[PDB]
Design a protein around this ligand. Structure first.
Ligand SMILES: Nc1ncnc2c1ncn2[C@@H]1O[C@H](COP(=O)(O)OP(=O)(O)O)[C@@H](O)[C@H]1O
Ligand SMILES: Nc1ncnc2c1ncn2[C@@H]1O[C@H](COP(=O)(O)OP(=O)(O)O)[C@@H](O)[C@H]1O
Length: 203
């Protein structure tokens, strides 16, 4: 089974992807996590991607398409989490999979109002070393676990990221709807309730 998680930044896609991958045996492909690793390592991809990420912009399509070609699991279940982010990326994904006799089975849209998004992101804290994600209100980190607020989770960059999402990424909703594979998730609910709905729509 191949899944795509789609929706505004802060919707809880990474949180649910980690949960589903671990419980139901999926390979979790997070372009965000993979890019952040590239940046930390100072690879050619990382050095180029860094400036876009810092500004809240999307990394150029060709870079991301190449990355996915490089890391796509040949066999097994996959969750694409944060990819595709543009129509060109979605078209490239369809082409890649078709060459392998595969397809995207379900696209889950994590629906959540802008106001909730802003609250999710502004309160997001991460463990810089493990990438583990917390929320100052909804899932506070234990004391003694060192967390930070990501620079791209500050008000100005959140605003940009949501604008970029609406312009470039939201059209994927209609792209996938017309393939018949879109399922709707109310991502505004608490974490366990959202997870139950994720299990429901793919079962
Ligand atoms: N598929 C992609 N295409 C282009 N850029 C991407 C992609 N995935 C991640 N990025 C870059 O990494 C940043 C963080 O991505 P991600 O971790 O998916 O988002 P979020 O902060 O909403 O969880 C994005 O704002 C963008 O700069
Ligand atoms: N259902 C939920 N209710 C409340 N907070 C959540 C929920 N899901 C995730 N969060 C918190 O919201 C923030 C964004 O979650 P994340 O998984 O990083 O979203 P995305 O990957 O869609 O950008 C994080 O701080 C996370 O702890």
């Amino acid at each position: 089974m191949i899944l795509v998680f789609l929706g505004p930044p802060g919707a809880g896609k990474g949180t649910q992807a980690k949960r589903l991958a671990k419980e139901k045996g999926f390979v979790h492909i997070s372009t965000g996590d993979i890019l952040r690793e590239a940046v930390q390592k100072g690879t050619p991809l990382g050095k180029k991607a860094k400036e876009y990420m810092e500004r809240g912009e999307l990394v150029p399509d060709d870079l991301i398409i190449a990355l996915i070609e490089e890391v796509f699991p040949k066999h097994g279940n996959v969750i694409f989490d944060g990819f595709p982010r543009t129509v060109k990326q979605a078209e490239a994904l369809d082409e890649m999979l078709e060459k392998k006799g595969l397809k995207v089975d379900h696209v889950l849209l994590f629906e959540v109002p802008d106001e909730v998004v802003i609250e999710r992101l502004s309160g997001r804290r991460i463990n810089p070393e493990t990438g583990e994600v917390y929320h100052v209100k909804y899932n506070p980190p234990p004391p003694g676990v060192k967390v930070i607020q990501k620079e791209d989770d500050k008000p100005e960059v959140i605003k940009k990221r949501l604008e970029v999402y609406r312009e470039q990424t939201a059209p994927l909703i209609e792209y996938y709807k017309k393939k018949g594979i879109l399922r709707i998730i109310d991502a505004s609910k608490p974490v366990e309730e959202v997870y139950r709905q994720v299990l429901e729509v793919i079962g």
